[model samples]
Target: YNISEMRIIGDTQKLDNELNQLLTHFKAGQLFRKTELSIIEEQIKQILGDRGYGSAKVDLYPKFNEEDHTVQINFIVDAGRRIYVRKIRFEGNDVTADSTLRREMRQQEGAWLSTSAVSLAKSRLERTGFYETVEMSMPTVKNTDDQVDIIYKIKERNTGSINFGVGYGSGSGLSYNAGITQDNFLGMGSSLGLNGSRNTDSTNVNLSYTEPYFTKDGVSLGGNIFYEDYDNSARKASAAYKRKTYGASGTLGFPVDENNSYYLGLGYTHDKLRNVEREYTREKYVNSMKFPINPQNSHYDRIQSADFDLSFGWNYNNLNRGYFPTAGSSANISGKLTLPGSDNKYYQVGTNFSGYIPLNSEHKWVIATKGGLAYTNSFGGKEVPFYQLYSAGGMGSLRGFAGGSIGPKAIYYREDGFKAPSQDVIGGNAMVNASLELIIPAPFISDKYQHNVRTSVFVDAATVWNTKWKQSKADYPNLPDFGDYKRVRASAGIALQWQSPIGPLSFSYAKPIKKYAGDEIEQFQFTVGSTF
Candidate 1:
């Protein structure tokens, strides 16, 4: 029958006006179809359901006005009793404490029922690393008409991990590392970990502890102690130097909101350097750069300092899924400062942004782009420690050059340093980098592994430069003129990323399209456990 007009005759005064708008689509002068009416009824029912009316009912009454040869339909709605949580319970948790899981819930007992709150509770619980899967179900209480019971049936995952392995790389040959961690300590939601690694030129040891939810309001506390020793010759530098560092720090994180946090940290560090270069290069470096390289000088071999810093960070993500997000955007921004009164002081700031656009409704083909910018500078004329500088190359960055090998040249004064070897890529104080990728389905992999394994073709570019916009001429007076910001690099590559039960793995093979001589090159780079 032809629909001449429709009427909504419910007690809608208590309902939201937005709900009333849904009926406007069923206008006059339209043909009435069973499918259209069914859709309209379901839409109104769901909105009422979200407004705490769990059992809301909608019915349609259509009549043929014989005198006009048109139909008029009446929509009658019955919003049932508003549901509220009477009690909450957990099941299948063999080791995790019930109190720990309940803290993740935003919907408290005796609060009105909300589907959004239920979904967010499940998400927060899964992120705790204590559960492999979280399933929530609401069942009406047997004795109460308006009360509901919430149940979380969780599947727990292992929280203790130990790994020991040995590997090889050009930067650190025949290296070995081992680590042990317990994310859920004694069924409490605290973490403790210890790790150490060593190679021919460097050795490092680290220990840390964390309590993610220490206070009732979810404040975080953590601390770390570490020691490192490095020999510059192993980094392919033109001159040789020995450096050692030992430090300890404490951290505190407080949530500003659901997606933002503030971090405060205080630390102490002892840094020492030993000039191992021969007499010819040593005196040349000291004279040109006015560096204190002589053994007799007190500042020549050591830097003892203390520091305090605070940072504000935020993460806003709308990804459809974790590990392989096909249709969402994620962004992160942070800025940190090394406060004064430290032997070495500096400030750092950066931002990272990424967008994922799905090409099809199925999310089979996707386009993703990532970009970031950062800068660091010294405070009060104090030097920015070398270890804190930034570089762009190797696996995690440009992917076509060696790690830390695509920036301003720090001409190392050596016996053959005048040859302009570019052995020292004086890390930049500012950096800009971006990547554009086309995420494609793996050719040989099944659809079941869609999130675990994926292929991408990408283009990457990065530029690093000093703040002064000039390269160092002090270290090499007679060599050719050097330029800063002229060392920007670009690459194109095909890559694979996989998230296996054991660990994550990634590999890339790239060709440098823009490069200058003396910049270290590595066309193939891959790692098994981490990205950098």
Candidate 2:
């Protein structure tokens, strides 16, 4: 059924939790494209066998009740015979060596056919985005009921794609974006990506290449090349051209395990201004003061710097997935180090972390929460210098303020058209955000796909903490405080989101709990394209 009605049992929460866990990689009884009922039954039986219920029986039934918008999945599980793959086959291709393809398969000639292993392999390959579609199985072939075939029939997609488009958002009223990427360059484990964005007066370009198995032994190799010039959107009345940066860099990434990833990178860059601007003497910053452009300013002398960067990421499966992160959580940590190649001794470092938790999942009702934080540091440097020390606010960061409106006493948002109002914090900056979300799946899924294409409502509350570094003479004006948290520039918002093929679409409206000084926090935020 494309759409229908559904009802729920009190224990629906249990089913929801178990369902997501099983389907994160592949759903049980997913008959259409494999993961058939027989396979699901076998896997569940094996689970019981491990628990000493070697004679358990497992039956599945999907039922719905339209009045309550709920679905009841009855799981009658029993442990059957413990089994392992004795033989495997590939009947589809002749090009790549079976050995090569088999390396990517979860099921092997002589390995336990665990449900999770098979599903994980499918997920890993799917993420490559090289194939239009793929289906995998642990199904018997040639009447040998005990043996299975780990098969995949992939139709190639146009790995090479060029995207050109124009869009508008609150921060960047109107902008043009273009990019070219090849996910499967030359039919190998190589990928290349390049994209550029432009507003009427600014432009930026980026380049990246990745070869997963570059070295014969699988030690990977990757690189990136980038160049860009952007105007500071924030400038004082007397300021002419804000500071700008031009740089290039590359990095290497490695998978530490199923849950962790790490990266190391290096780069060099130049930064300068073209006008005399006001500075937050209180915050130790000369806002409009020019670096290279000022006669007494010697930004050029300190322009060159060698940049070092490090990052580590962790993805835990306690939840389902990012798009539908029903349970688990994820977090990332990153920091940077820069040493002036010129005469300046300026440098910086920063860090960030975020994650989520699922509160309830009964019937089609799901309540979950997400949160994150970012911090940055610097010395005589321009911009947020470090990802940790960047300005916060708006949809993606500190919710109540303008995007990049919160900063080290100075608004350091990359300029979209011109500039943002002036500010007076001296310290770098900090942003933390948290949201609680409630969702209901579309009816159709109950009878067919089980409401995977659900709809949701959410509220995000975040704040940016602004404090100055060691004080200089110039400083932002002391504004009256609002609400209770003197350390907050926070906001609250609501959104309606829908799951779709490309991704979810959302329209959000928000109001700041306490607005940033001279900042206009947007009342609404929306997205037109898929987030992926």
Candidate 3:
């Protein structure tokens, strides 16, 4: 028989529109099937159950009209009792503390059962980076139909690793590193890491530890100590200065919500500068010709300084996965300020954003965009430390250009009365960069390996400029202004990234679309143990 009409019988006020919409599925003049009525009844039960009415019943009663060959249906909804969660339980977490898992949950015991809350709690657990799988189910108590228990099954993965490796980078050349990292230290959900790396131009060593739940309620505490030695001459940058720095910092992070957090940090460092050059004399004595030839020509002869650093940062993240995310977006804004009493008093502020949008239901095709803006300058009539200035190019910035090559150049005039730009990039006080990518499925790979590999075509653009740059006719006549923002560099490239068993590996080939003379270009780049 054709269904002529349908009506909801009990407690319709709370879900009147929702229940009515289901009736539209069986319209008047449509052939009626007795089986279809049961489907509608089950759908109503699910709707009510999700709203805490676990004992709801939908009984269908149909009246037949003999002549018209049609039937009328009534959904008798018996929402008996609003179910409350009796308990929340976990399974398969042999190493992790139950408290750690509980704190990640949004659903609480004794609260009305909410399916949405249950699902959110599952996602939170997956994001902790300590689990291989998370599954949830609700089972009613045997004695009471209105009481239910929420159970989560978690499979923990190894959260610690120790390794020694040798790697090659297109920019940094050859390098060696060794580290011990533990994300869930001793199952307490704290993290500890010790790492050291050495390359042709730099050496670094650092140790860090973090307690993710230092005070509960998602407050985090962390500290790190580090030492670094960098050689600008060995790196082939325009400026000629070398520095060694050692520092330590402690940070406190406060969680604002499920997706937002902010942090404050304090640090102290001792810097020793060597190979002090004459670049500072050009900036300081802009219009003077009788430049000092001895130690006076340089900013400092064997300079050493102690500085106190304060930093603040805020972050927002809602990516769907901890790695290889296919949806959602994340952003960060941070600033670092060296105390005024320090020898080089300066501040740097920067913001970065990354977003991923899936174009298909299976997330096989996606669009991703990234952008950054940063500025740094000194206060109290001091110049920003040349070593601390910003530069763009190479991996993580503009891909086609050589590392630290897309910035202002230190100028020199030869004895032949010819003006020339040096290979050393002086860097700049301000920087901007952006990239857009179309992520596609990697080909010629098994289904098991498909999600681990990502291939994309992208375009990148970036520029760095010094806000304090002044064109001095006596010092740099008939030459392009240093740190000019208009000299934006751009490139288009294709890249492949794989989450390998050892580490993340990335390869890219780019051709510069906008470049000027003397801009160092490196079209092919690849890295082992890192991703860009």
Candidate 4:
């Protein structure tokens, strides 16, 4: 029979208003089937169920109109007693404390049972990276239909590990690392780590800890002590200086909301540089020319500086998962500055954004976009420290080029007095980069491994330039402008990422679509113990 008219009965004005908005599937000209009536009845019950009417019922009565061959329908709604939560409980959390899980809950006992609140609590637990899966259910209390218990069933994952790994990269050479990390220390949900690594160019060690829930209101406290020894000659960088840097920093994070937060950090750093010398090899020519490095013509000596550093940042994150996020977006903006009395007084600021859009219901096909911009300069007319300059290429930046190899070059005079650009990449004070990727499931991989593997085709572009560079014609003639936007490079690549038992692994094969002379090209890149 065709539906002639529909009427809703036995509900409040507000409830009928909501039902009217949701019952668009029923119309006067639609063919009325008994199954359609049942579906609509269940839909009405679900609507009331979400609004704390746990025992809601819906009945449909049809009146036949013999002459018109149509039916008149009436919906009778019984929104039973409003349900309240009696208790909230957690199961399968042998290591994680009950209090820890309770603190993450949004729904409370003695309050109305809200399905949205329950779902939100489950998502929060999953985002902590401590659980493999979280399941929720609300069961009515024994002999009482108006009271229900909210139960969360969570499967805990290993949150602590002692790891040692070796990896190689085309641009950075071979590296080795060892670390001890615990994301859920003693079930308190705090994180602690002691990590060290050594590569061809640098050696680094750090000890860090964070209390994610330092206060009951979701504030965070974290601190780290780090040391690094960098060799410019070993890395074949543009500058001719080696550095030893050590610092300690403390940071406090305040949550403005579920998806937004801000942090402030204070730090102290000691920088020691050795073997400071002019980039020019010819000693007589260097003395005559106005050298940017050590312009006073004094003997090169070791330099040291102490800096008081301040930093602040804001972040927004709504990703579905902390690791291998398949949905949502994130962004961060940050700035750093050294105090006025400190040597090498400068400020730097940067911002980055990334978003993931699912193209399929199962999220097997997705699109991801990311971009970033950064700028830094010294204050009081002092030159920006060379070591703090920005460089873009390889891995996290441009995939087809070698690391730190896409920037301005220093001028070099050959033995025959021929002046040309050197291979040394002098990094810049400003940088911009972006990438677009289509994520797909890995081929030849079983569904069991799908969650741990990710494959993508991507295009990346980036440029780095020194805004303050102004070389005179007398000092260096016929040099290309280092700050030209035309120098931007682009590449297209296919990448694979795997979360292996030892660590994360990544491999990529890229082809440069745009490049210029003196740009270092590396088509294939791979890394272990880390992600791209």
Candidate 5:
């Protein structure tokens, strides 16, 4: 959508002349497509895949053959349309129960059908650490209304899997001796379950399971049980909590009506944190609700099953309290949208939102974004965890500086003259962050050359602005307005990646725009996500 094509209405000769110049620019080896932005977008799509995006066309007006004998060109565009999956049909899930499969698919039946959504559903299911191999296909052209559909065909492995992560590497910055965790225990393809694990110095207990085809109509029933004591060296804190969590959740994804996916659920969450006072309760409670949105796009690149068509979701949560955390309410919403008509990337504009408001005065809201790149697949998009967010720099924000230091944060120095913030987590500060990235093709890999060694460069500029979290002076002892608590930060980076037999590896180098923070000013970062 960022790039586009159109017919010029002015002087025919003038338009042809302009086209000639544009074509010439491409032939000189400058563009990937005949049109400027179009080709540039193609270049990005090849390199970035669905995650990458950048480059856009705003508005351009054309000039006719003027008295001066000069001509004008008008350029106008509407970002771009995002393509997504509408629904998915599992033809042979009778044994597992369609409802069970629906429960397994984090993507709702009627949500955006995107590569990312497919990827996420696959991961969530695999995390049961369940499947041996998972496969999903975007719905191709349809014989009906031409609506798109997604199909997730899973090859479930024997439910029994044993996970052993034994290494000499510094794990959680700890030198350990023994480690254990029982991840997969193939049940009768459906049964109640239990689990346990430990580190060189910690231990825990867990259990859970399911009722396949819980109802003859193909509904599913499942839940989990857990117990553990753990420490956070990073937080310089340690604690333990023991409680029983039990619930039954399932779904009926098949439609009774044309555009509606009728589904419902009933469940409760309860827990008790050992040693915690009535004032400080671990998050524990019960929740029951029905999610009947059209299967749609919930976030960019993330497609729900199919519906109803692609739509996103955001819920308002209002849970307030602490260990058997007792009271409060919050709102959580997540969704993906398609441009009117686009280049075929579902979820050209993706959004995820969550807000929490307690009757007692604790308030929080989170923002996440996934959207268009100059064109589809220009570059990979970013994945922001719904709740866990950090600053763009310093300690809690950028780490390596003082922890809990920088933010939309209030500033100050500790007795040691080192960096520090005025208050705890949210009380200190908050900020909003967003990015646009593009993936471009590497000539060496493009042109249909199967000679592997593929590559690309994705560029992005992200910014965040912090805000004050409290207004009551009573919350601060010294009440140091240390600083007005707010600042802005932006940066751009490039990723040089390679596809090899092992998998894919990337080298990233990011630099700030206005200023630098500490020794860890994010000069570069290296990572390996997963296999294709």
Candidate 6:
């Protein structure tokens, strides 16, 4: 029979918004079809299923007025007894403690069977990075129609690694780092690590520890002790110096919500500065300069200082599943200030923001953008040390230029009136850098590897300038303003990424599209490691 009108009857129980909305679609003026009736039945079943009414029965009945070719419909729903989660069980896990696994669960035993809670709990376990794979199934309790049990089948993976790698970079030259860490230390959700790195002119070693659930309220406590000897001559930065530092810090991180966090920290560092010099200076600083040969002239050599700083940071992140996110945004803002008592004091503040936009459901095709800015300056009438200045370029900065070689120049000359034009990237009191990337899937590998392979094209831009530009009297004829906007450098490139079994491998080729004189141009860069 051709039906023209519809109504729902015998639906006595309705707390769910979905149940109520189902009747609206089969309203009084529409032509009724059998498929439409089937949809109404299914939706009614689903809304009840969410509340533990898994076996609810729905029967559709229609009364027709033949003269008008219209029918009134009745939805008779028999929602069964609400179900409960009787217990949660796990399989295929040997090294990980059941309690450790339970900590990641969002659903509780004896709670109502909620589809959303079950799904989120599974997601949480998968995101823990502690498993090879996780699968979930709901099985009915024998002889109990209203009671169900949740089962998690997990394949465990090693949660600790002894990792070491050596690599070369335009900025640091030949550098190597080694570390061993455990993400699930003793299966208690704590972390312990020791790491060290050495470059051509620097060495750093540190010990770190974290208590992820320090107080049982989800607060995190962490601490680090470090020693570093750093030299900046590689980039020929005018403010280059050898800085030795030993320090320790204590930090607390607490959640603002599920997707945000706030961090506050206090740090103490002992700093000894040597060869803090200017190109040309009076003999007064001759004794302070540590390097005997071609010793840089002027200012604050053999400087010693002890400083304390308070730091604050905020972060927000919410993104869809998968590596190299296709949809989501994350942001960070932070500031650090050396308190008033140190021999030399300064403050730095910066922010970073990044977002991903996916154009397809599989999230294989995506757009990503990232940007950041940092500014540092002397505080309380002190001078910001040269070693602390912000410098840009190189791999993480501008791919087209030598790392830290895009800024103002420090020119020192021989006794001859005219010498070859020489410039050292003097670093900067302020800096900005940004990048845009379009990520695409490699057709063959994505299908073969199950989407672990990625390709992208990108553009990057960066600049650094000192607001308080200073030059020794020696640089009078060859200097340029430090804060010139014309100094911005830009480049574009393509990259390949693979989530390899051993680690992540990334390779890129770049060409400088916009550059100024003296900017060092590099066309290729990559990171080979477990994670990059």
| Candidate number achieving the greatest TM-score relative to the actual structure | 3
Ranking by TM-score: 3, 6, 4, 1, 2, 5
Model 6 has an lDDT value of 0.73
- Provide the overall lDDT of each model, using Cα atoms, as 2-decimal numbers: 0.72, 0.51, 0.80, 0.80, 0.35, 0.73
- Candidate 2 deviant stretches above 4 angstroms: 1-159, 164-166, 183-188, 199-202, 215-219, 234-244, 272-278, 281-318, 339-356, 379-389, 407-427, 436-470, 473-485, 499-504, 530-532
Cα error, candidate 2, residue 343 (Å): 6.8
Query: Taking the tens digit of each residue's C-alpha lDDT, what string does model 2 give over 1-532?
Result: 2113222222221333443354324433322322454675565555444332334555666665677644545556433444556655544443334444455665555765665566677676677666556676555556865545556666566768888766555555567778988776666657789988886446878787887764444545677676666564443211223445666666666655667666666666555544323332211233312333332432223222334433333333334665656655666666555554432333333333344444454445666666666554445554443212344555666443556555444433222311333443322455566666676565544556554455555566555554433242233244333111245555655555555566445556766666545664567765444332
lDDT of 4 by residue, 1-532 (tens): 5666666776643677777774745554577665656777877777676677766768777778889987777777788778899999999999999988998898878888766667788999998899999998878888985689988999999998898878776767788889999998878899999999998888999999999888998788998999999886754355446789999989999989889989999988998877654443322222332233443543244556778889999999989987778899999999999986677678999999999999989999999999999999776646677667788899889998888878877655443433656777767789999999999889999589887889999999999987755543345556667767568999999999888886778899999999988788888998876522
TM-score of 1: 0.66
Error of 1 at 22 (Å): 12
Clashing pairs in 3: 1-32, 237-424, 238-424, 238-425
Clashes of each: 0, 41, 4, 0, 94, 0
| CA error at residue 475 for candidate 3, angstroms | 3.9
TM-score per candidate, chains pooled: 0.66, 0.58, 0.68, 0.66, 0.35, 0.66
**Candidate 6 local lDDT, residue 263:** 92
Candidate 4 TM-score, C-alpha based: 0.66
**Which of 3 and 5 is the better model by lDDT?**
3
Give stretches of model 6 more than 4 Å off: 1-161, 166-175, 182-189, 235-240, 275-277, 280-300, 319-322, 358-366, 412-421, 437-453, 470-477, 500-502, 530-532
Better of 1 and 6 by lDDT: 6
Please state every model's RMSD to the true fold in angstroms.
6.8, 12.7, 6.7, 7.2, 22.3, 7.0
